[PDB]
Design a binder for this molecule. Structure first.
Ligand code: CL
Ligand code: CL
Ligand code: NA
Ligand code: NA
Length: 129
């Protein structure tokens, strides 16, 4: 599923991400835009052989099991394919674990480089929330 901007904002709000660990909703929408272009089916392979999955591009070296990343942890205890569903619950629950691990949203390179320090409220402007 490719989400609309306000549709995703609403879904993320219902799943408890607005101000989760102090990150306002616009941060999460901005991160999803530049990680996946709002596409739950997005996958990208990394140089080290791991792969990133879903709307928030969660990596198989640490967070999910894809059967082909040797020596990986499955810290979210989920198959990586569950992160590609039109239902974002599994991606959101895992992202909550990631953002709580010490480095905040800096775990997402695209957030650090394209969202951090910008007017992220613009990503939810105009939405009925
Ligand atoms: Cl915001
Ligand atoms: Cl980047
Ligand atoms: Na929308
Ligand atoms: Na893994």
């Amino acid at each position: 599923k490719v989400f609309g901007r306000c549709e995703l904002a609403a879904a993320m709000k219902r799943h408890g991400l607005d101000n989760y660990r102090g990150y306002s909703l616009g941060n999460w929408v901005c991160a999803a835009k530049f990680e996946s272009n709002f596409n739950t089916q997005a996958t990208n392979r990394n140089t080290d052989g791991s792969t990133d999955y879903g709307i928030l591009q969660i990596n198989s070296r640490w967070w999910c099991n894809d059967g082909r990343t040797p020596g990986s942890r499955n810290l979210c205890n989920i198959p990586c394919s569950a992160l590609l569903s039109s239902d974002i619950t599994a991606s959101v629950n895992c992202a909550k674990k990631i953002v709580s691990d010490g480095n905040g949203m800096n775990a997402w390179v695209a957030w650090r480089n394209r969202c951090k320090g910008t007017d992220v409220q613009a990503w939810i402007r105009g939405c009925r929330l």
